Amino acid sequence: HGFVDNATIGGQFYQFYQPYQDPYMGSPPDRISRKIPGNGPVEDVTSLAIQCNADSAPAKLHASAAAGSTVTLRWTIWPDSHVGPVITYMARCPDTGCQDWTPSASDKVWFKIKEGGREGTSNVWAATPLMTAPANYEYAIPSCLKPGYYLVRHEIIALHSAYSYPGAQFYPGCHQLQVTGSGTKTPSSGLVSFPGAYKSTDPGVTYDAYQAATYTIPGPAVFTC
């Protein structure tokens, strides 16, 4: 249980959508990140909720950043039972902006930019550092990306209850970037849709985290420039 609380993008601080603050205001604040219900998991890989969380909507703002630059995401406190991989994807929005665009359930627009899984057969996972404050994560915007508006999808997949399916707990959330710079590339391989990328039967989705086994991270190969 948790969500990305804020980030540092293009050197600037952004408070993400706040599910326990924003809905109660007379006028919810403009955000660079998309609405989420709260800190609970999505458990249905066939649902659009797996994309940007349940009952989401486009965000009003974008955060400017240079291709090749580093982004920091800061999670709320991550429970130590919630071992699992941490994965980040991007998708290019229309040049008219992400603010009124949501990929459809069959839009193969998402490319994986970073992933981490289980360290060998140990109990150390990519989620582990987030279990000790400050709960911080970094990713690099690929340096070759053509300037434009992009959605970023970030998730932890907690596997403490994933022996069968449904069981795996997905904690996805999306934020919006204006990528700038000298890049010329638009990813056109390793593209997937959400839903679609993950199947209930994937070895990393139905998974026994309490046996001494290695872990196959779900989804496509990582994009490389």
Ligand X SMILES: *[C@@H]1O[C@H](CO)[C@@H](O[C@@H]2O[C@H](CO)[C@@H](O)[C@H](O)[C@H]2NC(C)=O)[C@H](O)[C@H]1NC(C)=O
The least distance separating ligand PER from the CB of residue 157, rounded to whole angstroms, comes to: 15
SS3 content of the chain, % helix, strand, coil (to 5): 5, 30, 65
Please choose, out of 27-35, 42-50, 59-67, 130-138, the segment that lies near ligand X by the rule CB under 6 A.
130-138
The least distance separating ligand X from the CB of residue 2, rounded to whole angstroms, comes to: 8
Residue 92 interacts with, from ligand PER, ligand X, Cu ion, none (CB under 5-8 Å by kind): none
Sign of the CA dihedral 44, 46, 49, 50?
positive
> Which residue, 29 or 38, has its beta carbon nearer to ligand PER?
38
Does residue 135 touch ligand X according to CB under 6 A?
Answer: yes
Does residue 79 touch ligand PER according to CB under 6 A?
Answer: yes
Which ranges constitute the DSSP H helices of 93-174? none
Does residue 160 touch ligand PER according to CB under 6 A?
Answer: no
The least distance separating ligand X from the CB of residue 138, rounded to whole angstroms, comes to: 14
H or E element that contains 50: helix 49-52
Does residue 38 touch ligand PER according to CB under 6 A?
Answer: no
Cα–Cα dist 147/163, whole Å: 42
Does residue 72 touch ligand X according to CB under 6 A?
Answer: no
Residue 6 interacts with, from Cu ion, ligand PER, ligand X, none (CB under 5-8 Å by kind): ligand X
> Which residue, 171 or 215, has its beta carbon nearer to Cu ion?
171
- Judge whether 137 is annotated as a binding position: no
Query: Would you state the structure tokens that stand for residue 88, as one six-digit string?
Result: 């980040």
Residue whose tokens read 């026994």? 208
The one-letter amino acid at 107: D
Neighbouring residues of 102: CB distance < 8 A, sequence distance ≥ 6: 51, 52, 56, 57, 58
- Judge whether 150 is annotated as a binding position: no
Query: Would you state the structure tokens that stand for residue 124, as one six-digit string?
Result: 């150390």
Among 30, 38, 46, 133, binds ligand X (CB under 6 A): 133
H or E element that contains 51: helix 49-52
Cα–Cα dist 109/35, whole Å: 20
- List interacting residues with ligand X (CB under 6 A): 5-6, 74, 76-77, 133-135
- List interacting residues with Cu ion (CB under 5 A): 1
Residue list, annotated binding site for Cu(2+) = 1, 82, 171
- List interacting residues with ligand PER (CB under 6 A): 1, 79
